[PDB]
Each structure stands twice: as structure tokens, then as C-alpha cells.
Amino acid sequence: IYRAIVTSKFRTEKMLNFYNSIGSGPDKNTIFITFGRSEPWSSNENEVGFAPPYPTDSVLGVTDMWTHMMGTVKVLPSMLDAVIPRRDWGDTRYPDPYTFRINDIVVCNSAPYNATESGAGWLVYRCLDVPDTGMCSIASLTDKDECLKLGGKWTPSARSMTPPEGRGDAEGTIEPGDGYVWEYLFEIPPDVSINRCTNEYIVVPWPEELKEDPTRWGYEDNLTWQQDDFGLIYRVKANTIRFKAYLDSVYFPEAALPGNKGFRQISIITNPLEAKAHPNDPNVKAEKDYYDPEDLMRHSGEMIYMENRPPIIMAMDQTEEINILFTF
Amino acid sequence: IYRAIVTSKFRTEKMLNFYNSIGSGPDKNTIFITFGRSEPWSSNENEVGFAPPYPTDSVLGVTDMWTHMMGTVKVLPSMLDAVIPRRDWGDTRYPDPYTFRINDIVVCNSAPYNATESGAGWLVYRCLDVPDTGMCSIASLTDKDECLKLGGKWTPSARSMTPPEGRGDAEGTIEPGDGYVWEYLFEIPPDVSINRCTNEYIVVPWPEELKEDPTRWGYEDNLTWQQDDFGLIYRVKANTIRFKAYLDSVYFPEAALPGNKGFRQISIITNPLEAKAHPNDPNVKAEKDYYDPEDLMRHSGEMIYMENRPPIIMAMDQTEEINILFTF
Ligand SMILES: [Cl-]
Ligand SMILES: [Cl-]
Ligand SMILES: [Cl-]
Ligand SMILES: [Cl-]
Ligand SMILES: [Cl-]
Ligand SMILES: [Cl-]
Ligand SMILES: [Cl-]
Ligand SMILES: [Cl-]
Ligand SMILES: [Cl-]
Ligand SMILES: [Cl-]
Ligand SMILES: [Cl-]
Ligand SMILES: [Cl-]
Ligand SMILES: [Cl-]
Ligand SMILES: [Cl-]
Ligand SMILES: [Cl-]
């Protein structure tokens, strides 16, 4: 018998494969987000706390989605962000605002309780070491080094005195002198932090963004690329993609008339086909930016995600943001 | 609330993303399978039923894999098969040889108790319907029709009297006349059954090889391609890949000389880099079919799979077949 494991990096690998499957240039895939269902779920749908039934993963579910479909929009690479959980140093809204463990990924310079450098965006660090005092996950072990050696996890008893600042050593090492050791990872520009990071997630730049513009992400001093080729997403174990997609009513004016009832569904379909003159004609992949559902081969493509929701009213010359989370 | 789900098709999508990612380019992946560790696990290492310890998913574990690494072999697309569980109609060696549920995927024409067409390969079908008499997974429901209406699963009390034969309706529907209704899916060529299938899995052809030669897979009558572009893997919810990689002693003569110690580890690394003359030199992805650890940038690429196994001693003119399963 064998002892095999898929590493955490395979999750990142899967996420990156999906992201790289789309785009410009060669033989790449095309993915669409769809919206539909004007017909009310029931007389309830408008009252507070209403929740529609879950979508059904079946042939019938896909068919019903197409029947209610009102529009489709091409998903661009730019609408996809790799994200990881957000942990702000010193945020007293949540537990352990000043206490961390080795490998924790923390944010600084994102708020007053965190400010370290005007003129820099949010600064992200990884905890390399903690104070010798504390306890182990495997209770019996009272020595930090022994705890870690045996695969235990060490919770320090002494808090981080000040937020890590700067980029640190040539290797990015930072020693505040409070027993904690930190490693500088990267910087998040304001356009990203303001518009794409949330209370729960921070964006980690894709490898191509890092090769293209390292200073934008305060990564010009990084040396780890000599081995990891800008795979910051792997280093921080990013495995979730967050969509910042937009449904612009200017391309579907009949779906945003004054007084409309709104839409209730969203779906993602990979590689749908354009409509045909005769069903036996050649398959042509849908590559245009948007399609009235009538202009696509009904039920073509593969529906990988489905979502039912209370009704949202689209307004002309206005856009609606759709956010989706894919975990790999 | 916003009730969203990822469909079973998303699993097939990730598997396919992975398969199609292999190649040359910045938006593609080169994949290598490594082998190593001649040092014994321990003295019982040879005893029957011996199980080595599990590899460790950490930087130290990657460091150790590289330390013990003996060689690396480039993985080619031809070494990857999409598979689904094999359920042979009437095979009494396993449970429920004659009882099926809607959507079960069954294999016929594989044995005497399964024969339906001399000259043809194994024939794959999907159960569309089952007898009215039976039991619902939701006890308080007597009717079969109702059971399924509430997301239940119906287990018929009457068994299948005979396996389906032929390709069925214009849409592949078959009715043996025993209360079971089947749908013809595809045919597996004889060479594939012998060389790529196992007692546990059967291969499902990839979209491009199927579109390229439908007759090979008894798919020439198919019409669903008018919507699914030959996406059979999605139709049958295929989500695991089986590797068929070969380690030929010719490539590593020294590693396999008489009186061998053998190899005990296998790992899979994506996009490793070749060695550099200077640390600061540009990154060069490895693309040759073979490499000795020494010729790659140590710890380069991302290790997505690690496996420990009992020693296997290679020798003069011998080839070890390595089989791996990735479930997406
Ligand atoms: Cl883009
Ligand atoms: Cl604290
Ligand atoms: Cl934005
Ligand atoms: Cl990238
Ligand atoms: Cl059409
Ligand atoms: Cl979110
Ligand atoms: Cl793909
Ligand atoms: Cl090949
Ligand atoms: Cl049975
Ligand atoms: Cl073979
Ligand atoms: Cl067999
Ligand atoms: Cl393919
Ligand atoms: Cl292929
Ligand atoms: Cl090197
Ligand atoms: Cl196997």
C-alpha cells in the first residue's frame, strides 16, 4: 500500500489553471456569466429575510436556467482576483489582535490601529517565529522547539508589541525585538485595496502581474523569484478566486426598462457555442463580449456554477456588480 | 440569502483545465514525475503489508524530497486518462450485480454474463429509469415518482433481467422491457480496455480525441455534440485522471545497477526551472524529457503530489510503470 497526498499547492495550481484557461492570444477558453428569471419566486421574495430555493444541479436545472436567461456577458481575466483570508494586525474587532502563530499572514498599514508608512499601500507579512514563552497544541510539550519538531503548533503568551514595518532584511526578515520575527511579502496598491479587498479578503497578485509590474506590488526587492518565478500565490497558499463581474444594462436595455421586476438568477458557463442556421452546422465557439440568449446554441457550454437570489432591479445606464467565490 | 452552488461539471472542468494546461508557454505547464530515496524506510520495510509513513506537506518535506531525489521524467498528455468507476452489468463478484438506480453508469459486453455484441468493445450505458416497485431513501414516501420529486433516490425491488444492447433511440434510449430504461453512451476500443482500464475504472475519451475519431469510440451516431462539442467527460461527470508513466532504466543507468537499493518516493512537480550559472540569471523552465536533480534549480517548480511507497528495485533493461490518481 502507498501513502500519497495532494499538497496545498495543488489547490493553488488548480486555481491558476482555471485563470490561465481564459484570455487572449492562442487557443484559450471563453467563459460567461449569465443572468435571468424575471418571474417572481413567490409573493415572498420581496419581504425581509427572504431566500429562494437552492438551484438544482441537474439537466432540468440547466434547462430551466436557459429558459429564464435574459443575457450573457463574457468574463474577462481582469474580473478575476486570487484572494486569501484577511487578518489585520491590531484589529480589536476580532480575537488575538496582537497574538500570532508561525505562518500567519497579516496585514499592516490598512488602518489607524495599523499605520506604519504614509505613502505605501497595505503591507503584508508572514510570521516566521514567535516568543519562546507560551503553549503547544500537543499540551504535553512545554518547549517551543520540541513542539514544532513534533509537528505541534505554538501559541505565544506574549503579544506582538508593534506592527511590523518596512520590507526588512535582504531576505525580508524583520525582528521587532519583542520575540516575534516577520517576513515582508508584498504591498497592495490603493486601487486594489479600496475597490477589490474586503473585510474578509485581500488580493494576491497573479504571477504575470508580478513579472510585469513589481513596483506596483512593492515586490522589486523580492529575491525568492530566483526559485519560485513570482509564484507569490503559491507561497501564501491562495486557493480562492473572487469575481468582480459587471452586468451593464446598456448592452441589455430591454432588461432594464423603468419599473422592471429585476433578475433572480446567475450562472457561469464555460465555452458556450453560437446559434446555428441548421443544428448540424459546424460548432462555432462564442467569443463575443455579450450575447442575447437567443444568439447562442441553447444548452451549449458547461454550467459550472448556479445561484438563485432575491430579485435585484437593473436600472438603465447603470451597472450591477456580481461577486462570486470559487474555492479550489 | 444568496444561494449558490458549484455543479458536478465544475469538477470535470478542473480536471480538463489540468489536462489542457500541459504544454510549452507562459500560460501552460510542464509536469514532471520524480523518483527517489534509496535509503531504507526501516528494517521491516520488506515485510508483507508494510506501509511507509506519509510524506509531509511542508517546506521541510519538499527539501527532503529533493535531497533524496534520483531522477525526474517529463509527463506527456498521452500518459493521462480521464476515468470513472467501472460497474460491469451482472458481475456477481461485486454488490448489486443486477440491481441499478437512475444515473448509474454500467458496462456491458465485457463478459459472457454481459455479452450483447460479438466483435464490439465494452459498451457503456446510463440508467434512465427503474421499476415502480422498490424503496425510497426517504422512507415516508411510497410512490417512486414522488420520491424523486423531492430529491430522493429510488432503489427498485425488481432486478434487471437483461443488459441493454445496441445504441437505442435517435437519442440512445433503450427498453429491455423489464422496467429498466437505458441510454447508450459510448464504446471502448479493445486496446484501451486491455492497456488503460482496470478492474476499478474505465476510460472516458477526452473531447478532442473523441471529436477527432468518433467511430473509434462508437460515437459516430452521437448528436449531442451539437450542444456539448463532444464533451462526453462532462456528460458522465468524469473527475479523476489516472496516470500511466514509465521509468525506464535506460535513462538512469547508474540508478539501476545490479544489487540495487531501489526507489521509495514519487512526487509530481509543475514548472521546475533548469539550473542557473548565477542566481540572478533569468528563469528558464525545464522542457527536456529527463533531468538529473543536479540540472534543475533546487526546490524550483511547485510540488503538487507526494507519495511514499515500499522499495521497488529496478535493474538492467527494466521499466517500472507508475500509476497515480488525481481526483478533481
Ligand atoms: Cl483582461
Ligand atoms: Cl492579543
Ligand atoms: Cl476595481
Ligand atoms: Cl499569471
Ligand atoms: Cl441554434
Ligand atoms: Cl466576497
Ligand atoms: Cl479546458
Ligand atoms: Cl502526448
Ligand atoms: Cl442484484
Ligand atoms: Cl498504454
Ligand atoms: Cl476485465
Ligand atoms: Cl481534449
Ligand atoms: Cl486528446
Ligand atoms: Cl541552479
Ligand atoms: Cl489505479
DSSP secondary structure, A249-291, as one string: TTSSGGGS-TT---EEEEEEEES-BB--SSTTSPP-B--SSEE
| DSSP strand pairing (B134-136 vs B290-291) | unpaired
Strands, DSSP E only, in chain A? 3-6, 31-36, 69-74, 80-85, 105-108, 122-129, 134-136, 154-156, 173-174, 181-188, 201-204, 240-248, 263-270, 290-291, 302-312, 319-327
CA of B135 to the centre of ligand 9 (A): 14
CA of A275 to the centre of ligand 15 (A): 41
A-B C-beta contacts closer than 8 Å = 154
| DSSP strand pairing (A105-108 vs A319-327) | unpaired
Burial A280-302 (b: 16+ CB within 10 A, else e): eeebeebeeeebebeebbebbbb
| DSSP strand pairing (B105-108 vs B122-129) | antiparallel
Superfamily (CATH H level) for A6-81+240-328? baseplate structural protein gp8, domain 1 (2.60.340.10)
Cβ-based contacts of A270 with chain B (< 8 Å)? 13
Do B302 and A208 count as a contact with CB atoms less than 8 A apart?
no
Q: Which ligand is nearest to the CA of A272?
A: 5
How determined? X-ray
Q: Is B150 on the interface with A (CB under 8 A)?
A: no
Do B299 and A225 count as a contact with CB atoms less than 8 A apart?
no
Contact B21, A17 (CB under 8 A): yes
In angstroms, how far is the first alpha carbon of chain A from the final one?
Answer: 28
Nearest CB to A13; choose among B227, B229, B270: B270
Nearest C-alpha of chain B: how many angstroms from A111? 30
Q: What is the DSSP letter of B225?
A: H
Fold classification of B82-239 is baseplate structural protein gp8, domain 2 (2.170.290)
Helix, strand and coil content of chain A, in percent to the nearest 5, comes to 20, 30, 50
CA of B238 to the centre of ligand 12 (A): 13
Contact A265, A317 (CB under 8 A): no
Nearest CB to A306; choose among B4, B57, B302: B4
Phi, psi values for residue A112, rounded to 5°: -55, -50
In angstroms, how far is the first alpha carbon of chain B from the final one?
Answer: 28
Do A229 and B53 count as a contact with CB atoms less than 8 A apart?
no
Distance CA B326, CA B323 (A): 10
Query: According to DSSP H, which parts of B87-178 are helical?
Result: 144-149
Cβ-based contacts of B273 with chain A (< 8 Å)? 227, 229
Distance CA B324, CA A43 (A): 53
Do B3 and A308 count as a contact with CB atoms less than 8 A apart?
yes
Do B4 and A55 count as a contact with CB atoms less than 8 A apart?
yes
Residue to mutate among A9, A274, A278, A303, with most B CBs inside 10 A, is A9
Do B305 and A225 count as a contact with CB atoms less than 8 A apart?
no
| DSSP strand pairing (B181-188 vs B173-174) | antiparallel
Distance CA B111, CA B145 (A): 34
DSSP secondary structure, A120-170, as one string: S-EEEEEEEE--S-EEESSTT---HHHHHHTT--EEESSPP-S---S--ST
CA of A282 to the centre of ligand 5 (A): 11
Ordered by start, the domain boundaries in chain B are: 6-81+240-328, 82-239
Do B3 and A307 count as a contact with CB atoms less than 8 A apart?
yes
